[PDB]
Design a protein around this ligand. Structure first.
Ligand SMILES: Nc1ncnc2c1ncn2[C@@H]1O[C@H](COP(=O)(O)OP(=O)(O)OP(=O)(O)O)[C@@H](O)[C@H]1O
Ligand SMILES: Nc1ncnc2c1ncn2[C@@H]1O[C@H](COP(=O)(O)OP(=O)(O)OP(=O)(O)O)[C@@H](O)[C@H]1O
Ligand SMILES: [Mg+2]
Ligand SMILES: [Mg+2]
Ligand SMILES: [Zn+2]
Ligand SMILES: [Zn+2]
Ligand SMILES: [Zn+2]
Lengths: 43, 272, 303, 612
DNA sequence: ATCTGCTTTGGGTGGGTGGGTGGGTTGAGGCAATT
DNA sequence: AGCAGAT
């Protein structure tokens, strides 16, 4: 992320069914593969 | 689902019982009866009372948290926690039904965008000079202001603050050490603030002395201080008329200073 | 897993210290000179490094000095072994205490010199020079370098325990039968200590913007570079910009942990940091110092 | 599908909207929006603006793009983007940054230029919005503004040293020496429980190598509101800021700045042991933009003014226009500003090129005026009054930093005037120690301090232009200058020129002065041109003496000695004359000292010896 | 997963072999330098 | 009471 760690951008990804998951990170704000990678890694 | 306070967009305050209305209906109004900081004793705790004094200190407005909104990085749910104390312990593990059923350990994180904050401000109220007994020193009392009452008190104003007299319990170890002694404060709920031309003006400047027409004229000229200061060439001629009074002790110098300083809007009285 | 980049950087360093010339060999002679007079620091001209290897080797060291420094010490030791085998051991009767020298590499003559106000966090771990006027100097203390412990129960020994910014002890005894994991006693006889001095410097007066308070920094000297800076001097240090953790939080034996209005929040989540955070500071590690500002004995000095 | 948390606005639509805005936009839209369409030209307004801004940025290698909010309101597409920026600044700024990077790479990809692409891929790109609405007040910041873009105008008050903020953590194994870098999220390290290597899967064998991590620049500034925002006059409040990356050290203490940032709030822990937090939240501002509120042509103009026949009187008049009928004093001060040549000598000591002038006379006349003017003109200098607590202090002094509780050596006014003019308004009332340090400066041109364990010397190559007043209510011509001035003969003997400006009561003189003063209710030069000319001459020109000048100097000195047994002149006057001639040569931008320069110098020195 | 155990706030119911660059800040009294 | 460690 270009900005600092505490910038604080929050995400809401929509699953094929109508449920929303939350991800943090500008890269997630831009991309979806990064979002899924973070979802897997945060487990 | 979410606490009732989260969706509230209003603040509730109590206006005390006015003296005239209490007398109209043959009743006694404790709430609107003014008290000094001395009379506010330990048996008034938990009541709606009024205090008379002058404000000596007002802190800056800041956000006080009422409801905290968390988020789950796995379940995708949101949690709400209510805070009604000086301190609190944040949540660190998801409590959502999905997380518990699936056992997934999803960390909870704070979110300031969804929380609820109330404007907070702390003031101090001190006894008036005429209220302190003989051979005593004045006392002061804390005041808490929340909601839309903030910025309604400034240092120097003589006010009749109406509020709820409550204790401020300590927390954790400090509570154990402090014993049974308790700090107290007042939750502000209502605040009442208290309140030939040349010759005529000169003679009216200070009527309690014997007339000094020339000095009074010069002092009035000082007070108005008319000047056109726009040289704009690097600096400008001074835009104030300065006056000096020098006399043997016995003439009304201090009285003239006091009067000329009270009349002026920006007058500041000091001693060398 | 070996560091492939680390090994190759060492190989290039050895080639530099054997074939360089300007027409006699320069650093080969210095190692011989160091052998005669029994010194420790070996000085290297940065300009000498750039010309060799199209300048590639110089960039690797300068950009990442903290990472590659241990490999340089390996490289020097090999070149020391080929030409001056006796130098490695530290200098009527047979002395028993001949440990291994603790060499130091000093660099000078960098292309540019940085002001105190121009120190940023992008250069952490790199090699650079700075200029400032000293204002306070600490006292020389012994710094633990290679600690040596003994197991409290089976009397085993642990040697060469690299020390981080805080006191460090072993976590696993080398005796298979032993079960000790967190019980040790230091052995100051076998431990190696290095000299250590803390110097505080501030930016030069002429470089201060008008009506601005000065900036300051803390420089750490070691070995023979100690006491080379006196307060009031205008020096030029050359070292590596480092970051020093708040050792109180990390957990010290017998120590209880614990400008910016509370906004200086550190990083957390580390295993050692239970619920506390680790905050950092910018510091310096100088390896070179320059201060900008009887008949028979006298005759011998003259040319 | 990607949606910002708590809202119903798509990120993809935002990205495409801003990309369309950037690739196609013209200033004419902004002009018509502000009702300035009639000022539209045909070349600049009709050319793509931000495409040119990206091309120039690529050419210069910079990354930061200064964006104005109104331009978003100028384009039909981006009204919602502007409002979202004002309401959700973080995510909007993120998508803006990525769109900037994407369009930057796309430009090269489409235009198949020879510029390297790997270098572009390595750069972090940013946008710095500003002018996002009427600036609010520090006292009007309510909780409703938390996480929202605001504008603050305030005076800087302090700035802490650069703080290393961690970006990427670095971990190393203790049994396989395997390292992997793990990013950071909101200040928490996601440290691993075991090596990622299949072969070595040992658990809980990770260490943090602090010096191999990645850090970013952070700094904390303190801000205080402007005077005009104070309603009654109470103590101004203070707000704390945070600046990251290229905005670090973007403003110095005492500056008036306008800051655009996100009004954030963070919890505070009750103690450094547990996780309990105080209910009160502390606020601050996360800044994204800060604003503060010689050429060949200049050289040609300087030559044109230099060639002017009446250059001398022109500069003299321009120095201090508002003063009346003090030509000699102004001429002397003009010479002082330029300063004589400075000599670096081998086999010999250093010879100072400064000029010290004492402006002493009755209190009625204008003397602090001239010092203020000189301070304004001087490229370097200070203003001070002897025995004045307000002034910084004339001598370097050791003190303790209250902010950091450290000892710091602080240079005084004289040292800070190095290469400039230090105007001391009240020369008469001075401490004896101050008069000793002044003697050391005017003699050795350095200040030596050897206290608090520090032994140091500071260069103080500064001129002096002091003013003096008589002991009584007026200057008595009968008594000598020394008796009236109340200064040691050793001290007033060192000034190169001493000016006795007396207010003798004359009908004509008072008439003229009153006429001038009342009217205040021959071209002249702007102060900026004068200071640039002075700096150019003082940095580039170095006049040299010649045989004719050497003859005239010797002859004039001998003549000034022969006038007297009373000693009319001393060898000090010779140094004064040579310095003044050098300064006069400098003013003409001449590299040589002619007969005219030495003759002008003698006329001023002889007149100065005259009434003094 | 449960049981066992230490330490705060800040303050003298921890201290001066931990000090004052870890904070608790006015009041009085002695000494050198300044007068 | 919260958090740090041994069975
Ligand atoms: N003309 C006057 N008429 C009435 N009272 C006067 C007059 N002049 C002086 N006084 C009285 O004189 C008393 C002393 O005056 P004040 O304190 O103002 O000045 P002062 O004694 O000259 O001052 P200082 O305190 O500097 O010695 C006041 O009570 C004032 O009422
Ligand atoms: N050309 C001039 N000649 C004489 N007096 C002047 C002139 N221009 C301005 N003045 C007067 O001088 C004043 C500014 O000078 P200033 O008061 O500083 O006098 P000074 O001699 O430097 O010092 P002091 O403060 O002791 O009077 C202006 O307010 C005006 O009264
Ligand atoms: Mg009086
Ligand atoms: Mg004056
Ligand atoms: Zn969950
Ligand atoms: Zn063992
Ligand atoms: Zn491993």
């Amino acid at each position: 992320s270009a900005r600092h760690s505490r910038f604080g951008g929050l995400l809401s990804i929509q699953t094929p069914d109508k449920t929303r998951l939350t991800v943090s990170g500008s890269q997630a704000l831009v991309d979806e593969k990064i979002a899924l990678q973070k979802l897997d890694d945060s487990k | 689902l979410f606490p009732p306070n989260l969706t509230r967009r209003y603040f509730l305050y109590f206006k005390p019982l006015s003296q005239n209305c209490a007398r109209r209906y043959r009743k006694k109004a404790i709430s609107s009866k003014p008290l000094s900081v001395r009379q506010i004793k330990g048996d008034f705790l938990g009541q709606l009372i009024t205090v008379r004094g002058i404000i000596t200190r007002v802190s800056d407005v800041k956000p006080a948290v009422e409801v905290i909104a968390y988020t789950c990085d796995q379940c995708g749910y949101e949690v709400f926690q209510e805070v009604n104390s000086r301190t609190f312990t944040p949540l660190s593990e998801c409590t959502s039904e999905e997380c518990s059923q699936n056992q997934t350990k999803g960390q909870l994180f704070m979110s300031t965008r969804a929380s609820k904050f109330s404007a907070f401000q702390e003031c101090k109220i001190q006894e008036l000079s005429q209220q302190v007994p003989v051979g005593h020193i004045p006392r002061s009392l804390n005041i808490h202001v929340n909601g839309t009452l903030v910025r309604s008190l400034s240092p120097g104003d003589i006010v009749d603050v109406t509020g709820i007299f409550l204790p401020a319990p300590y927390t954790g170890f400090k509570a154990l050490k402090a014993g049974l002694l308790t700090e107290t404060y007042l939750e502000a709920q209502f605040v009442r603030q208290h309140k030939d031309v040349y010759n005529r003006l000169a003679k009216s400047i200070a009527p309690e002395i014997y007339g000094n027409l020339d000095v009074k004229k010069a002092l009035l000229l000082l007070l108005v201080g008319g000047v056109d200061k726009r040289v704009g060439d690097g600096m400008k001629i001074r835009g104030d008329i300065n006056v000096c009074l020098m006399g043997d002790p016995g003439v009304a110098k201090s009285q003239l200073l006091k009067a000329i300083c009270k009349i002026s809007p920006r007058g500041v009285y000091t001693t060398g | 897993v070996d560091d492939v980049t680390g090994e190759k950087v060492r190989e290039a360093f050895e080639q530099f210290l054997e074939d360089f010339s300007v027409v006699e060999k320069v650093y080969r002679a210095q190692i011989e000179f160091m052998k005669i007079y029994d010194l420790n620091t070996i000085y290297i001209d940065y300009q000498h490094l750039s010309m060799r290897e199209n300048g590639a080797l110089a960039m690797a060291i300068s950009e990442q000095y903290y990472r590659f420094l241990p490999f340089l010490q390996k490289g020097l030791r090999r070149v020391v072994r080929k030409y001056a085998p006796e130098l490695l051991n530290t200098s009527t009767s047979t002395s028993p205490e001949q440990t291994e020298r603790v060499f130091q590499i000093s660099f000078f003559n960098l292309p540019t010199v940085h002001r105190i106000r121009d120190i940023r966090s992008e250069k952490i771990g790199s090699l650079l020079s700075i200029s400032g006027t000293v204002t306070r100097t600490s006292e020389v203390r012994p710094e633990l370098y290679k600690a040596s412990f003994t197991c409290d129960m089976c009397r085993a020994i642990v040697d060469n325990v690299e020390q981080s910014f805080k006191y460090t002890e072993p976590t696993f005894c080398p005796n298979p039968s032993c079960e000790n994991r967190a019980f040790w006693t230091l052995n100051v006889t076998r431990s190696r200590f290095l000299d250590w001095q803390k110097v505080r410097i501030q930016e030069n007066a002429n470089e201060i913007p008008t009506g601005s308070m000065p900036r300051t920094l803390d420089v750490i000297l070691r070995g023979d570079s100690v006491e080379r800076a006196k307060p009031g001097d205008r020096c030029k240090f050359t070292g590596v910009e480092i970051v020093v953790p708040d050792v109180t939080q990390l957990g010290l034996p017998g120590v209880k942990p614990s400008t910016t209005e509370g906004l200086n929040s550190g990083v957390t989540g580390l295993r050692s940091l239970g619920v506390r955070d680790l905050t950092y500071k910018i510091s310096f590690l100088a390896c070179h110092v320059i201060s900008i500002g009887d008949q028979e004995v006298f005759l011998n000095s003259l040319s | 599908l990607r949606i910002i948390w708590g809202t119903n606005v798509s990120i993809q639509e935002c990205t495409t909207n801003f990309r369309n805005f950037l690739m196609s936009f013209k200033y004419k839209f902004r002009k018509i929006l502000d009702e300035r369409e009639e000022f539209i030209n045909n070349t600049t307004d009709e050319e793509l603006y931000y495409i040119k801004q990206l091309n120039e940025m690529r050419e210069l290698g910079t990354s930061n793009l200064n964006l104005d909010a109104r331009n978003l309101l100028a384009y039909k597409q981006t009204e919602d983007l502007y409002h979202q920026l004002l309401n959700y600044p973080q995510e909007v700024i993120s998508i803006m940054d990525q769109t900037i990077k994407d369009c930057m790479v796309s430009l090269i990809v489409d235009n198949n230029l020879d510029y390297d692409l790997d270098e572009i891929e390595t750069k972090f790109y940013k946008v710095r919005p500003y002018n996002v609405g009427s600036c609010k007040g520090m006292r009007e910041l309510n909780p409703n503004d938390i996480d929202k873009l605001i504008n603050l105008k305030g005076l800087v008050l302090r700035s802490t040293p650069v703080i290393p903020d961690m970006k990427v953590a670095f971990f190393k194994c203790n049994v396989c020496d395997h390292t992997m870098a793990v990013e950071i999220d909101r200040g928490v390290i996601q440290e691993p429980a075991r090596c990622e290597r299949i072969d070595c899967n040992e658990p809980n064998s990770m260490s943090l190598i602090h010096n191999r991590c990645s850090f970013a620049d952070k700094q904390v500034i303190k801000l205080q509101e402007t005077p005009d925002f104070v309603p009654d006059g109470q103590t101004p409040h203070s707000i704390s800021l945070c600046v990251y990356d290229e905005l670090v050290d973007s403003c110095r203490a005492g500056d008036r700045i306008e800051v655009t940032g996100t009004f954030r709030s963070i919890p505070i822990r009750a103690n450094s042991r547990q996780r309990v937090l105080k209910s009160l939240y502390k606020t601050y501002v996360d800044v994204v933009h800060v604003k503060k509120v010689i050429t060949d042509q200049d050289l040609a103009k300087i030559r044109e003014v230099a060639a002017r026949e009446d250059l001398y009187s022109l500069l003299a008049r321009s120095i201090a226009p508002s003063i009346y009928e003090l030509e000699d004093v102004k001429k002397g001060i003009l010479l002082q500003l330029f300063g004589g040549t400075n000599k670096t000598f081998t086999k010999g000591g250093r010879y100072r090129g400064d000029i010290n002038i004492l402006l002493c006379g009755d209190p009625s006349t204008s003397k602090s005026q001239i010092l203020q003017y000189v301070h304004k003109i001087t490229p370097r200098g200070v203003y001070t009054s002897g025995k004045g607590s307000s002034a910084v202090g004339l001598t370097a002094y050791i003190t303790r930093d209250v902010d950091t509780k450290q000892l710091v050596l602080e240079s005084g006014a004289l040292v800070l005037s190095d290469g400039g003019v230090c105007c001391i308004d009240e020369f008469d009332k001075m401490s004896d120690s101050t008069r000793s340090v002044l003697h050391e400066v005017m003699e050795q041109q350095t200040i030596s301090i050897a206290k608090a364990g520090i032994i140091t010397t500071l260069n103080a190559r500064s001129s002096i232009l002091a003013s003096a007043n008589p002991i009584g209510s007026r200057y008595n011509p009968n008594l000598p200058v020394t008796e009236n001035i109340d200064l040691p003969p050793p001290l007033l003997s060192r000034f190169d020129l001493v000016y006795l400006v007396l207010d003798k009561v004359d009908e004509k003189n008072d008439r003229e002065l009153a006429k001038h003063l009342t009217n205040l209710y021959d071209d002249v030069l702007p102060v900026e041109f004068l200071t640039m000319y002075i700096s150019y001459a003082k940095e580039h020109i170095h006049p040299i003496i010649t045989e004719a000048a050497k003859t005239e100097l010797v002859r004039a000195y001998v003549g000034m000695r022969k006038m007297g047994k009373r000693i009319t002149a001393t060898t000090r006057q010779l140094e004064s004359m040579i310095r003044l001639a050098e300064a006069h040569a400098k003013m003409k931008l001449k590299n040589v000292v002619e007969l005219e320069d030495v003759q002008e110098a003698v006329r001023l020195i002889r007149s100065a010896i005259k009434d003094y």
